[PDB]
């Protein structure tokens, strides 16, 4: 049994997408089907269900009036057309067998899912700022300094330190995705306190999609 989804991608608030699921390995015309969502880092959420013959359709209230589910049993294809997309609809969409039996149900088999991204902004470069300690804990003279990379649109951002000179103690962290639609990222290095007055600390941020190369006096 294989459930292969497609038809998703990057959309912007409003508008419409149409998701399609090709089914094989089983008698498609005899099973109910349902779509289920999973936002990045969040749990599962049922979207809509369609019966085997298509006579009965069900929708979650969070999608009612905006989504509509369709079936084509002769081609073994499941459809979910989504209108008036909002930021809440940003998630991975799974196609699943929603079976019906004598007193037993369930989402028997799942597809690998397709990504649907609703976002308003177009493309944006970052602004880099330092993160100085200003406090000295002096636990084996270990002081930690870094730089934050704020409000960039495309996820690829490569961060170096002292143009590759600084490799020991480097920690670049995964980014946030803010309600503004942009990403923010931070990188920190732990350094001996004996170097505060001798070693010049420099962070090297490169954001290729927008042609920004920012090196800040961390």
């Amino acid at each position: 049994v294989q459930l292969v989804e497609s038809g998703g991608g990057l959309v912007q608030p409003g508008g419409s997408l149409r998701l399609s699921c090709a089914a094989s390995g089983f008698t498609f015309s005899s099973d109910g089907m349902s779509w289920v969502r999973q936002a990045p880092g969040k749990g599962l959420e049922w979207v809509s269900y369609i019966s085997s013959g298509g006579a009965t359709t069900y929708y979650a209230d969070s999608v009612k009036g905006r989504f509509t589910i369709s079936r084509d049993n002769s081609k073994n294809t499941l459809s979910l057309q989504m209108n008036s997309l909002r930021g809440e609809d940003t998630a991975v969409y799974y196609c699943a067998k929603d079976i019906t039996a004598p007193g037993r149900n369930g989402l028997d088999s799942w597809g690998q899912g397709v990504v649907v991204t609703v976002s308003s902004a177009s493309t944006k470069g970052p602004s880099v700022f330092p993160l100085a300690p200003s406090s000295r804990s002096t636990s084996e003279s270990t002081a930690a300094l870094g730089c934050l990379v704020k409000d960039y649109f495309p996820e690829p951002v490569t961060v170096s330190w002292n143009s590759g000179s600084l490799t020991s103690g480097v920690h670049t962290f995964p980014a946030v995705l803010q309600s503004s639609g942009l990403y923010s990222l931070s990188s920190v290095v732990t350094v001996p306190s004996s170097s505060l007055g001798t070693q010049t600390y420099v962070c090297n941020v490169n954001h290729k999609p927008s042609n920004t190369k920012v090196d800040k006096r961390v």
Binding site: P13, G14, S16, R18, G54, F67, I69, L85
Partner: protein, 402 residues
């Protein structure tokens, strides 16, 4: 305009500054009220795409004619018909069992080809939406002078500075409506709404019209031809609506599948709908983000004095869906044009105003004598009195909202 509309949306304009953002929906109006400014009603009535180039046409009901078959014995090669390579004919070759019962010398698999002429009865057409080629149509109506007979009135709107019509297009997001003695109203809207018209087709089935995504339209399993017609279009995958069955050694039956109206209409369930007439009319969809400035929008009749004669209701105060109250009055004076004294008060003496007036700066225009004029108020929660006129021969009407 805008009074009887269910989706009415009394959005308030910031008193003093000329900054107002408005969401404009299809089938819903917006009433913008400012300070020392004429309240104006704004509705997005029509959204049109104009540029329609035919992309691909599909046939959903067909006719068959001239069914024929040619059969061959085993070890005598391949079957052949003169129309098997014809563009308008659909064919199928198969291997049937042949032998002495079928009038053949040997027992083996004989070649059988059968064809028939395909004719399209009814067709649907998917055509192109050229992105950056939209056309929004907005109507604007001004309060105060107008009476409710103007609620539904679209004629004379150029001479009347009461109702302006505006068009907004991609590459021309700015616009400014002329309201004459009311001044002018500017508005800069076009959202570029992530509603990817560059990725949709306009599907016309038969007097039924829809807005359709491209990847689904390309994978429709029905006969098709790309462009428009110039005589005998060449259909492809004609097998989609015609099937051969049960070949018996000299003949194979072939039938058309029938109408695919319900199949595609069911497949289009939940799509963005549309219409067409006048050769260019189109969709019913809204979500128009606008930002409008009313700096050049002046009030008309501020220099008028108050009307002195008596009024009379020609309609009793009627509550709307949103708690506002509409009022129509006749005026028995020659004082016109003049300012109508309108107010609400729990007080009755003397003469504290409580609520708001939607029809800001109410006036009459006709002079002599018994002119009509209709007005809308927003009373406070609780009790209040509707007061039209001044002094003797006044008009008083009690009200209870909610």
């Amino acid at each position: 305009r805008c009074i009887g509309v269910s989706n009415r949306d009394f959005v308030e304009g910031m008193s003093g500054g000329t900054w107002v953002d408005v969401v404009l929906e299809h089938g819903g109006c917006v009433t913008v009220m400012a300070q020392d400014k004429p309240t104006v009603d704004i509705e997005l009535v029509t959204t049109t795409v104009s540029n329609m180039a035919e992309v691909r046409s599909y046939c959903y009901e067909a006719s068959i004619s001239d069914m024929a078959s040619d059969s061959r014995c085993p070890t005598q090669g391949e079957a052949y018909l003169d129309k098997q390579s014809d563009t308008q004919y659909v064919c199928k070759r198969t291997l049937v069992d042949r032998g002495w019962g079928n009038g053949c010398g040997l027992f083996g698999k004989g070649s059988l080809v059968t064809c028939a002429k395909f004719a399209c009865s009814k067709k649907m057409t998917g055509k192109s939406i050229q992105p950056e080629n939209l056309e929004y149509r907005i109507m604007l109506s001004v309060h105060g002078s107008q009476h409710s007979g103007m609620i539904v009135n679209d004629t004379g709107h150029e001479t009347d500075e009461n109702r302006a019509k505006v068009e907004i297009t991609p590459n021309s997001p700015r616009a400014e409506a002329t309201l004459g003695g009311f001044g002018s109203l500017g508005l800069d809207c076009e959202p570029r709404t992530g509603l990817d018209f560059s990725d949709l087709y306009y599907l016309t089935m038969n007097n039924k019209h829809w807005l359709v995504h491209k990847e689904w339209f390309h994978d429709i399993p029905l006969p098709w031809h790309a462009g428009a017609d110039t005589g005998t279009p060449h259909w492809n995958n004609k097998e989609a609506l015609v099937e051969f069955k049960d070949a018996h050694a000299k003949r194979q039956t072939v039938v058309v599948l029938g109408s695919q109206e319900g199949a595609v209409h069911t497949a289009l369930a939940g799509a963005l709908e549309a219409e067409m007439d006048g050769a260019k009319g189109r969709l019913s969809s809204g979500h128009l983000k606008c930002r409008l400035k009313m700096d050049k929008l002046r009030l008309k009749g501020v220099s008028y004095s108050l009307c002195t004669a008596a009024f009379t209701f020609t309609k009793i105060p009627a509550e709307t869906l949103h708690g506002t109250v509409t009022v129509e009055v006749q005026y028995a004076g020659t004082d016109g044009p003049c300012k109508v004294p309108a107010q609400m008060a729990v007080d009755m003496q003397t003469l504290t105003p409580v609520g708001r007036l939607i029809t800001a700066n109410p006036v009459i225009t006709e002079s002599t004598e018994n002119s009509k004029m209709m007005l809308e108020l927003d009373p406070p929660f609780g009790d209040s009195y509707i007061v039209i006129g001044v002094g003797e021969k006044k008009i008083t009407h009690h009200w209870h909202r909610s």
